[PDB]
């Protein structure tokens, strides 16, 4: 009926989590509790840089050898880095676990650091990373909301550091933030937990953040569209009320008016990002603020239901596939320390009603000072007094 | 109206929430120096006309009084 997410631990402290499923392939990944939040402004691009260099060269395998092999096995090799977590995962035919795991072992330890080229790659892309307006907006919604903290700095880092980075520095980040107790080996799909535990024993057995209500406005009138993000302080990753906030986002769901609940270790950003022609930015903002307020004082069981149901169809599961699940296993072992099953999520969803939703929404959204990040033709975007006054009703 | 006022480019603008910042940051700390800075850049343009108004006013008064004062011989 339902998978078990059997998880164990090893000498090193590395955890080995798995969730067997009847699908045939598997997504075996390594998560690491290491991101841009653990960097100290002298190595602001070390994690990103490592990834670029990683997946390319190692101790048992020279240069393409790993890349060459994974292709040989037919597996897809992916890696990503956030402000708090780093993931290296392989999607591959289950039978290949033996090598899907040994390969991952090299990638986390015995890696060989090309550095010159990757620097160029990162730098040049960054020179163009400016094209991703949305990412820009979201990396300032971070800078202006977490001013003076390690949560303001981006994952990529400033070009400065990128140019000024050396093997030893990298080696440090690698030797400092790649500890075995901060690592999860997660497997999803057609894997046996005992075989994966034996492979982890054979290989890999060797291994005050503050929100500041503020505003950044990057005005550039030549852009055709404007992107605006407004957020308040998210509860956190472990905070129980996160779920009643997700239902609130499901109630909200001008243009491209998305909604986000980004969570970090006891902090986060809860808000909305919308892209609109300049002339309508103010009307959008007014619209949006009215809605948050609607939930705060005027929810409706019907709509809550609409929200609970959409949330119910978002929960990730074997159906979503191996990777989606692995990814959830790795994040759950890194953040909560355990894999929360879908039945517990359903219980926490069904205990949410309209009264506690408007209570939790009044707790967070109502009256707190927001962080605003605008990019584009944002002259008609209202300044901080009008947004702050729109954060409450008379 | 707003949105069609002007065209600027690449001018980033950071700001803080009112409740997050001190109401009177270093009010007398730098206020005094600044007010004094200001007064020195404008005092030579402003004050000497009013100084000679004061001299002309006094002069007029005294002249007037003196004028009225009787010449002993008169
Ligand atoms: C000087 C000692 C204190 C000091 O150094 O602090 C720094 C501070 C100067 O700081 P700054 O950064 O150089 O200037 C920014 C202002 O402070 C920013 O604030 P502000 O001073 O511009 O405040 C807004 C202003 C707005 O002014 C008005 O509303 C004027 C309205 C018309 C004139 C008054 C109506 C009646 C006119 C009849 C003629 O209100 C006034 O201060 C008016 C000052 C003169 C009127 C008498 C006030 C008592 O000193 C003062 O502000 C002096 C005025 C207030 C005391």
From Swiss-Prot, chain A:
UniProt GO cellular component terms: mitochondrial inner membrane; mitochondrion; myelin sheath; respiratory chain complex III
GO molecular function: metal ion binding; protein-containing complex binding; ubiquitin protein ligase binding
Localization (cell): Mitochondrion inner membrane
Membrane topology: Peripheral membrane protein
Positions where Phosphoserine occurs in the chain: 166
Major localisation: mitochondrion
Modification N6-acetyllysine, positions: 68, 95, 117, 202
Family according to the record: Belongs to the peptidase M16 family. UQCRC1/QCR1 subfamily.
Matches recorded under PANTHER family: CYTOCHROME B-C1 COMPLEX SUBUNIT 1, MITOCHONDRIAL, METALLOPROTEASE
Description of how the protein assembles with itself and partners: Component of the ubiquinol-cytochrome c oxidoreductase (cytochrome b-c1 complex, complex III, CIII), a multisubunit enzyme composed of 11 subunits. The complex is composed of 3 respiratory subunits cytochrome b, cytochrome c1 and Rieske protein UQCRFS1, 2 core protein subunits UQCRC1/QCR1 and UQCRC2/QCR2, and 6 low-molecular weight protein subunits UQCRH/QCR6, UQCRB/QCR7, UQCRQ/QCR8, UQCR10/QCR9, UQCR11/QCR10 and subunit 9, the cleavage product of Rieske protein UQCRFS1.
Protein name per UniProt: Cytochrome b-c1 complex subunit 1, mitochondrial
Record organism: Mus musculus
Biological classification of the source: Eukaryota, Metazoa, Chordata, Craniata, Vertebrata
Swiss-Prot record, chain B:
A GO cellular component entry from the record: respiratory chain complex III
GO biological process: cellular respiration; cerebellar Purkinje cell layer development; hippocampus development; hypothalamus development; midbrain development; mitochondrial electron transport, ubiquinol to cytochrome c; pons development; pyramidal neuron development
Mitochondrial intermembrane side: 60-74
Coiled-coil parts of chain: none
Disulfide bonds: none
Main location: mitochondrion
Transmembrane segments: 41-59
InterPro entries: Cyt_bc1_su8 (IPR004205), Cyt_bc1_su8_sf (IPR036642)
Recorded topology in the membrane: Single-pass membrane protein
N6-succinyllysine: modified positions: 30
Top-level taxon of origin: Eukaryota
Positions in the Mitochondrial matrix compartment: 1-40
Modified residues (N6-acetyllysine): 30
Modified residues (Phosphoserine): 13
Keywords tagged on the record: Acetylation, Electron transport, Membrane, Mitochondrion, Mitochondrion inner membrane, Phosphoprotein, Respiratory chain, Transmembrane, Transmembrane helix, Transport
Localization (cell): Mitochondrion inner membrane
Description of how the protein assembles with itself and partners: Component of the ubiquinol-cytochrome c oxidoreductase (cytochrome b-c1 complex, complex III, CIII), a multisubunit enzyme composed of 11 subunits. The complex is composed of 3 respiratory subunits cytochrome b, cytochrome c1 and Rieske protein UQCRFS1, 2 core protein subunits UQCRC1/QCR1 and UQCRC2/QCR2, and 6 low-molecular weight protein subunits UQCRH/QCR6, UQCRB/QCR7, UQCRQ/QCR8, UQCR10/QCR9, UQCR11/QCR10 and subunit 9, the cleavage product of Rieske protein UQCRFS1.
Entry similarity comment: Belongs to the UQCRQ/QCR8 family.
Function (record text): Component of the ubiquinol-cytochrome c oxidoreductase, a multisubunit transmembrane complex that is part of the mitochondrial electron transport chain which drives oxidative phosphorylation.
Protein name: Cytochrome b-c1 complex subunit 8
Annotated organism of origin: Mus musculus
